[PDB]
Amino acid sequence: ERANLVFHNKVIDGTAIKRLISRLIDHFGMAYTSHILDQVKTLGFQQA
């Protein structure tokens, strides 16, 4: 099932990512966001 996210196109920063985590928790729950954080952590570390 396709997830109805929002295609962030401009930029993400400390405040932008913090809002996204807040919205992901309030929509998918902490179990989903805990996995999303790990994928985000790997993506951020890899591209850095």
């Binding site: 952590k41 570390f45 890899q46 850095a48």
Partner: protein
């Protein structure tokens, strides 16, 4: 060799040629590497290990 009074004869530990030598000179890059240097973490190569670059002797006295 002729020696003047006050000149150096032998140098002890952490001293090379009459100068304080507490470390080593090594190639270093300032880049993030997959999080293994996150914050104050340091990523080193095996060259520092098998090369005995940072090998130190420690003597413990049991009395």
């Amino acid at each position: 060799k002729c020696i003047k009074k006050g000149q150096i004869l032998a140098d002890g530990a952490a001293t090379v040629g009459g100068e304080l030598a507490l470390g080593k000179n090594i190639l270093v890059a300032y880049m993030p590497w997959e999080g293994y240097n996150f914050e104050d973490a340091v990523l080193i190569s095996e060259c520092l290990v098998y090369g005995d670059i940072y090998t130190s002797f420690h003597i413990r006295k049991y009395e």
